Design a protein around this ligand. Structure first.
Ligand SMILES: *[C@@H]1O[C@H](CO)[C@@H](O[C@@H]2O[C@H](CO)[C@@H](O[C@@H]3O[C@H](CO)[C@@H](O)[C@H](O)[C@@H]3O)[C@H](O)[C@H]2NC(C)=O)[C@H](O)[C@H]1NC(C)=O
Ligand SMILES: *[C@@H]1O[C@H](CO)[C@@H](O[C@@H]2O[C@H](CO)[C@@H](O[C@@H]3O[C@H](CO)[C@@H](O)[C@H](O)[C@@H]3O)[C@H](O)[C@H]2NC(C)=O)[C@H](O)[C@H]1NC(C)=O
Ligand SMILES: *[C@@H]1O[C@H](CO)[C@@H](O[C@@H]2O[C@H](CO)[C@@H](O)[C@H](O)[C@H]2NC(C)=O)[C@H](O)[C@H]1NC(C)=O
Ligand SMILES: *[C@@H]1O[C@H](CO)[C@@H](O[C@@H]2O[C@H](CO)[C@@H](O)[C@H](O)[C@H]2NC(C)=O)[C@H](O)[C@H]1NC(C)=O
Ligand SMILES: *[C@@H]1O[C@H](CO)[C@@H](O[C@@H]2O[C@H](CO)[C@@H](O)[C@H](O)[C@H]2NC(C)=O)[C@H](O)[C@H]1NC(C)=O
Ligand SMILES: *[C@@H]1O[C@H](CO)[C@@H](O[C@@H]2O[C@H](CO)[C@@H](O)[C@H](O)[C@H]2NC(C)=O)[C@H](O)[C@H]1NC(C)=O
Ligand SMILES: *[C@H]1O[C@H](CO)[C@@H](O)[C@H](O)[C@H]1NC(C)=O
Ligand SMILES: *[C@H]1O[C@H](CO)[C@@H](O)[C@H](O)[C@H]1NC(C)=O
Ligand SMILES: [Ca+2]
Ligand SMILES: [Ca+2]
Ligand SMILES: [Ca+2]
Ligand SMILES: [Ca+2]
Lengths: 390, 390, 390, 390
């Protein structure tokens, strides 16, 4: 019988490398015979036996006749879908889990938990599914687009932890954490500290005691809010990342935000979901992050790392590790996840590479994956290979 | 080793919410590369591990060259098909179970039973399949279109109960129930009471002792015949639902049928299969029902509920619970089903949303699913998103 | 662990009924988006858990550009393929087992055995595959198109029995039987009696001791050669069926062949593979057969039955049971098979319904299935629904 | 519970025969509705339960709009993919394992190991994946296109051995072997002897003590370098095959390289990966090889065998065993593999049949399979059946 899973030590390694590209629109030509789904906000979550590649589809394929509206975020057609990682998400390969315009998912060792938010902007609804069964919901508390992570939730000993938020995209958005067990919400956690705006948290285990998240402040700062959640006391605290290497887009020059660690600085309005994943060693913790190559545009994606220290207090620049996507290619959302090897966990970062041709045509994304493997330096970047005119 | 299943107490909850849309014709454009099957009369049935989405296909895809005849009900090509719930029912995803122009299916805890009626109108034949094996048949007893539920049958302790009927759609159609065990009919059950017209029953467990069904009278009344079947004595009785909230379509204004509960009233000719599902609690029983928003057309779908009482005797209006499908969208057949969570059952209602462009084009359907989940009020409605011109 | 299978008593029943149509070319329109494979000689074989639908493909799809040659029988491209019964055999659903222009297959309780003959006409080669592994071959002994059953072989206690033949289609073709165990040929059986021409045997168990086959004489007679094979002594004898109801096509009027049971009569040249399946009861054996409705053309298919007696000696007409395919629809090869229910076997007959438009267009087939189920009379016929111009 | 696998004695047999053709571009017509992937360098590897058909795709389908570049070898889009052997490798059937422009894979009895090399020419990177997890890397040691076998690696007792090489295609390329256990490289093995150029080794077990490989020298000779790797001491030595039957393409006339076994001779520049597989018997060893029918072009494929002796010392011609592909058809890379029967191993040779129409059109391949089976002589050749204009 399957047991609850826990975070384990990470597999040996000191550099990330290019692992896999999932580029469904390489097969979406009018000259072709395929039906890749139109998606955005992909993420990956893994259990003991398989990884699933999730996304939010507009319920439309390329080529097709429903391109109009695919540049939008929320409508009554959007669904959370998945395929086994490594499969191309087409109309036929994919499975439709639930209606959702914001999502998350995770495996607790026994079963998959799926999370989807839908409903009207002023009264949206988070829905929880455990395996095939719809099991619970959570209601909007600020009546301003309740929404969730767009990346994997995190389970330990059967308790799955999930960030949600609600509030104006250009004002206050005070997040909360839900503790969910076998598909049912058993506790709400209200974070303390710097809470004025936190959304799209990318979260993972720093240890058996602590979940950490690197999130997006869409109104006030280009520093990322950083959550430390103690899963033993079920309490969370949030402070801005102090590093000079500001991880949001847009952002000012590195190090140019004057004042104490808590200072907001300029170019704070706007944002992007960012990649973040832990490398747990015997007596060290590696924190790996990604940010766009452009300071203002969703172009390129670079990988950064820092071992140990307090991210709330260290102003040190992160160490640049490598270009995962060049400045000539799209770099949109990024997320962390861990693959389960036989005895250890493999930290990875995925990158959403959006095909953006404006509102007059289809709008979708490829997914690039980089994982910790071996030593040395990160060697190759990723391109989608897609010509949007075909 | 698998054991026989029994109905269990329902999962906690007090409102339904939008769960999932299966809209295969979102991919049926001539500009596209997909092959959704042309279907009608979808329904869902679940076993301990998976849910299956069934329908009757005309053995034709969209886009395709066999649209002519897809608006008809019975022919030599119609088949019962299924996919795993969440998969799009295409030519390649689907499995063809048996020739059938009327259908049902259910899981007894060990194996699937599939039910399909075909043959000439004056001498049709119900066929039973257990897993891969064709195991039994039952003959027409009135020689006027023997037909069955178009929704899940119900199994308890290995015994599966199924409504069948036979007789004029505009006259007498006295139903019977079959008791089926491991694919073989072991008993016929002859209901007493108000028996002159009962078809397309939507059935479920009120408890371990009782199956209840809400059915269609296509001839005499807009009230639904309501079956109570005692599975301990294998006997059944039928009376009209007394509620002022008449569930058939067409129907007169609510409460306008004067006289005692048994009064047939006006606008009784015509009808539609209706959603019905139980919420079994320790000391009370919830009965959830759906009906079109239009009193005369197959447009829209609203949800209603009433706890406890006797549906044969209570004239009280059902409580309106919300709009699942607005009156601007098609609302055709609806059906109940239950998903098996680990320790409890989740009641759901499914809605057939027919794409009707007349007899000169294709004729098929989407399926929308609403399930009991959380508390509060039902929040969002469903659209198919399909433009039939594409 | 799986055990060797043996023939069991047949499930209760006294009539066949229409079960299932597999008509892949309903989705082969140029207006469509599917890829049904171009096939002929379908047959079905079942194991304890699933039935497989086999055919010989020309390695070409409809619509496609390789129609030229699909009316032929033997070339270097033909392969034995299968899908799970109930799936449409398309390019993607199908699995390609081996190069073959004549085939057979069967399950021994533990594993599938696949049989395929290919090679040049004057030195063809039978190949045996057990699961994934190629395990043995048998060589041509008459150097005149070695060929096999085009229907399921038959396994008992791990020993699988298979008819092969070799010789002129318009002269002598003396068949042999191979005994194969775990993919390896362990014995050749040389039949005695009337052996001058036997091919395309349709075989099944009359009991644990005896396999019987109804075969095709393509040169001398419209009576079918009938094999009795004793699997306990591994000996076989062949005599012509004596019944006045001649099962081959073409054929003279029933009963018109004068003289003793062994008389050949007129219209013997030409032939067709015929359906034959056993209904094994406690103290009776039902023999079910099929033949075309037309005496000279591959049009229509009717079902016949006789209980008990010696088919070598009884001149009695078989009892007509029902029209499975009308005289207006194609009726080509037919075959027997048995589905394994939990405790008993279900006898079935499948019918190849060839789409024949001549050599200037594609040439393929649908498969119709009829099985023993319930009592009464056979109620409905099967049509392919295909318009070859689309 | 699974155990480590070891090479076993080969199944009985004395000749190869045509087994199976995988020709996905038979379905790639513009008139069709399929999406075979554009691939090259296919190979097959088998575990205890299934065989997988691997290839390197250009991440493009036929028909499609990305043909430009498919005649090249290395780019940022190439991926290692697989399907179950017998399935057509299409967009939807295939699974994408990892970014790779050179590949290998093998099963150790418990799990699949996948090998993919990508990165820039001057600093390429071998990546190892065990099941779903990326587990290790190995760096370029000569900074000139690190590359691997393009055929199955070989596992014994959980230890998997793999050839890699690095260096100029027209100069020195000294190979090494990696010993890999559960996805992690545990030893590097440095061969001695004739080491100046070895690439694309086709390797297999001669016994539990010895792996042998037949490789390609793209620079110096038409003789194949022949590796003997002792897995008990983890050491290797390489010498040229002495046989007069030179296996490379191009090559001079058989026997025309004068002088001792080590003589390089003429027409050594250029080369092709060659098929090689062992037939292990109680007291003898069969070595089966394939080479093109043309001495200078990649046309045709013939099979050769020799029992016993020392391939380093014996100048004797190999025995010609038959034409697998005629000189009218393409014969490109070939490879060995073994299928696991229940108690013994079946040696096979696979042949890449490239569809080459130049750089102005698509460039892909079919795969033909020949396996040891039965006795006598090899009887039929393979054609792809593909018209590139369609
Ligand atoms: C309808 O009748 C069935 C059969 O009696 C009821 O199912 C039974 O439910 C009880 C309690 O709900 C189960 O007892 C449990 O046994 C497990 C061990 O298997 C134990 O760990 C639990 O603490 C509990 O004692 C019983 O197993 C179960 N039987 C079967 C065959 O499933 C069902 O509850 C009834 N439905 C109603 C009342 O709505
Ligand atoms: C390479 O070495 C391996 C490991 O020693 C050899 O595999 C072993 O082969 C022997 C006989 O072929 C197997 O013995 C058998 O054991 C079973 C019970 O498991 C018994 O029923 C049989 O009668 C027989 O005694 C042994 O199990 C097997 N070991 C493993 C781990 O597979 C292999 O034969 C060698 N390859 C050669 C010599 O080519
Ligand atoms: C978190 O705690 C779990 C629970 O103890 C740890 O999992 C155990 O790890 C040890 C070896 O480190 C194994 O021997 C046990 O079998 C594991 N138990 C379970 C239930 O998996 C886990 O290693 C801890 N995570 C760390 C230390 O990073
Ligand atoms: C759609 O199908 C119907 C019924 O098959 C067709 O109507 C028949 O047309 C034929 C003409 O060949 C007449 O002989 C029959 O009497 C008609 N039957 C009925 C019931 O009207 C109709 O033609 C088809 N439509 C198209 C566009 O082909
Ligand atoms: C043929 O022989 C087999 C072998 O005995 C019979 O299978 C047995 O059937 C009995 C009941 O009839 C069971 O109790 C045994 O468990 C079966 N054994 C196996 C190995 O399956 C089979 O019934 C015989 N076929 C007939 C009588 O038609
Ligand atoms: C096929 O691809 C090649 C390489 O990408 C194309 O060749 C390039 O064409 C551009 C024109 O925009 C030149 O600037 C480059 O110098 C060319 N590169 C090389 C290596 O020649 C070629 O045009 C493509 N073919 C087609 C038909 O589009
Ligand atoms: C979608 O775009 C079209 C223009 O192409 C516009 O007319 C239409 O109103 C848009 N849809 C909605 C829902 O506004
Ligand atoms: C196939 O038919 C064409 C005519 O459409 C003919 O020219 C060709 O020769 C035929 N193929 C063979 C192999 O003869
Ligand atoms: Ca910001
Ligand atoms: Ca009515
Ligand atoms: Ca004849
Ligand atoms: Ca060379």
């Amino acid at each position: 019988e399957p047991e609850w899973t826990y975070p384990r030590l990470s597999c040996p390694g000191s550099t990330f490398q290019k692992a896999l590209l999932i580029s469904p629109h390489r097969f979406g030509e009018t000259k072709g015979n395929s039906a890749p789904l139109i998606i955005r906000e992909p993420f990956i979550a893994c259990g003991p036996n398989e990884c699933k590649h999730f996304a939010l589809t507009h319920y439309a394929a390329q080529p097709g006749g429903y391109y109009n509206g695919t540049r939008g975020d929320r409508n009554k057609l959007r669904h959370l879908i998945s395929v086994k990682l490594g499969k191309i998400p087409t109309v036929e390969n994919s499975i439709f889990h639930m209606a959702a315009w914001s999502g998350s998912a995770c495996h607790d060792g026994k079963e998959w938990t799926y999370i989807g938010v839908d409903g009207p902007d002023n009264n949206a609804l988070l829905k929880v599914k455990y395996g095939e069964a719809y099991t619970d919901t959570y209601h909007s508390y600020a009546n301003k687009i309740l929404r969730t992570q767009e990346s994997a939730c995190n389970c330990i000993g059967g308790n799955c932890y999930l960030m949600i938020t609600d509030g104006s995209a250009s004002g206050v958005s005070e997040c909360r954490f839900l503790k969910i067990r076998e598909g049912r919400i058993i506790k709400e956690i209200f974070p303390t500290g710097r809470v004025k705006h936190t959304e799209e948290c990318t979260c993972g285990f720093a240890s058996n005691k602590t979940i950490e998240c690197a999130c997006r402040d869409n109104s006030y700062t280009a520093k990322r809010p950083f959550v430390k959640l103690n899963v033993e006391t079920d309490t969370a605290e949030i402070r801005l990342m102090c590093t000079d290497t500001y991880l949001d887009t847009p952002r000012p020059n590195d190090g140019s935000i004057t004042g104490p660690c808590e200072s907001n600085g300029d170019k704070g309005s706007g944002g992007i979901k960012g990649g973040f994943v832990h490398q747990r060693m015997e007596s060290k913790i590696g924190r790996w992050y990604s940010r766009t190559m452009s300071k203002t545009e969703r172009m390129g994606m670079g990988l950064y790392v820092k071992y140990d220290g307090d991210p709330w207090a260290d102003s040190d620049a992160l160490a640049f590790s490598g270009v995962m996507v060049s400045m000539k290619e799209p770099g949109w959302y990024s997320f962390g996840f861990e693959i389960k090897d036989k005895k250890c966990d493999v930290p990875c970062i995925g990158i959403e590479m959006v095909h953006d041709g404006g509102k007059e045509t289809w709008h979708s994304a490829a997914t690039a994956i980089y994982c910790l493997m071996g030593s040395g330096q990160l060697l190759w970047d990723t391109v989608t290979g897609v010509d949007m005119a075909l």
